[PDB]
Design a protein around this ligand. Structure first.
Ligand SMILES: N[C@@H](CCC(=O)N[C@@H](CS[C@@H]1c2ccccc2-c2ccccc2[C@H]1O)C(=O)NCC(=O)O)C(=O)O
Ligand SMILES: N[C@@H](CCC(=O)N[C@@H](CS[C@@H]1c2ccccc2-c2ccccc2[C@H]1O)C(=O)NCC(=O)O)C(=O)O
Lengths: 217, 217
């Protein structure tokens, strides 16, 4: 099978795990565990980091036969090409490229807030920036079913993840944006996704490691 | 012509400026200035941030007729598709996708250090990690002339920028890796690039904004 390797956290592997299920991929995962405070041992990973034949060793990785890939975006693109879930026109490619990169910015922002010792102090200020973030997603989507246009593409897996994560952080953030709420329901309603979400493989939380100040357990 | 918008620094706009040059693109640039400490005024950008019709307002931005793009990687990709500077085979595409994202990782590592108020005391620990970073680029390129294979692609633009930045930071960091020294020379050897480096438009330094601890002026 293909092998997906990542920590036993949702983290940034969610979109890949969802895409693996959506495409009926034949895969197995190696979910590495971090030890506890104080050392947060990373040895299960460290002992084989340089022994997998990865060009730039990292997590997540995907082994697919002869192919070995690192960089979550690269894995997502690889699967997208494999299963034809890319933009098909120039307009669709642009929207996808924008979305991919924007999701990563919004991801980092959350991460940066959550790994900050002054979380509680920072939070209030961060919560006020949300509406403006959501409004940009909402206006970009507009009336389309999917972020790139008429067809589900790998970018919808990314958008779903970040919008979902945002919603968990601030449950009311999507109230003024019904098209985003509708997107989340349309995405979760895809058949394989629905099945996966009820399964033993599903890992919706924790989002971060033990180091974080939120969703770290 | 196309309009490229960014700060009046090299920052992450270097690969785009180089690619617009290498492609003989017709373009005009808007280089927004930031004020000095302690306020670091961003008003020149903020005055128009929400007036350019961008989906997700940011710097850099590319305006190409009716096409408005934000996200530096997206801008690179757009320009690459227009000029046929993408991988042509799956193997080139995979190599390109990894490098793109890897470059961003190594860029962010430099920023985390350069923006840390504790820069001077952090520096030694960072330096220690350089050789490993370079080694992985070195081994990845191996004997190829370019990062994706036998022809230049947009990812050489990003690779050039990051290797050059690290070399500026630690001049001796490429001594051990002749193939990296050679790639730099090859890149700079390109006629259009060579020509640009002598032009009035060339902006090598500062690397960072005025907020940084290094290469901020
Ligand atoms: N740009 C790359 C990034 C690869 C990378 O950094 N991997 C992390 C795990 S990922 C972690 C994370 C854990 C939970 C939630 C979010 C993140 C996250 C998000 C954005 C950026 C970096 C992170 C990270 O905080 C790691 O453990 N690396 C193995 C190693 O260094 O030996 C990608 O897109 O794949
Ligand atoms: N992921 C996006 C990143 C867009 C973005 O953050 N842009 C910054 C300037 S870019 C700056 C930088 C200046 C010098 C050197 C490096 C960077 C950099 C590198 C990686 C990530 C972020 C940065 C940044 O620290 C900016 O001023 N934004 C306008 C605003 O917020 O109103 C991209 O790839 O395009």
């Amino acid at each position: 099978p293909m092998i997906l390797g990542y920590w036993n956290v949702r983290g940034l592997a969610h979109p890949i795990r969802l895409l693996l299920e959506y495409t009926d991929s034949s895969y197995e995962e190696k979910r590495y565990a971090m030890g506890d405070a104080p050392d947060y041992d990373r040895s299960q990973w460290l002992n084989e980091k340089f022994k997998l034949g990865l060009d730039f060793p990292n997590l997540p990785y995907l082994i697919d036969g002869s192919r070995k890939i690192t960089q979550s975006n690269a894995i997502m693109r690889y699967l997208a090409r494999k299963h034809h879930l890319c933009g098909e026109t120039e307009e669709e490619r642009i929207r996808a490229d924008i979305v991919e990169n924007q999701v990563m910015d919004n991801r980092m922002q959350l991460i940066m807030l959550c790994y900050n010792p002054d979380f509680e102090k920072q939070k209030p200020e961060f919560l006020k920036t949300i509406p403006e973030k959501m409004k940009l997603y909402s206006e970009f989507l507009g009336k389309r079913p999917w972020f790139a246009g008429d067809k589900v593409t790998y970018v919808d897996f990314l958008a779903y993840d970040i919008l979902d994560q945002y919603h968990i952080f601030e449950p009311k953030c999507l109230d003024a944006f019904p098209n985003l709420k509708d997107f989340l329901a349309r995405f979760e309603g895809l058949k394989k996704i629905s099945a996966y979400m009820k399964s033993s493989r599903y890992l919706s939380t924790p989002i971060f490691s033990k180091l974080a100040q939120w969703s770290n357990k």
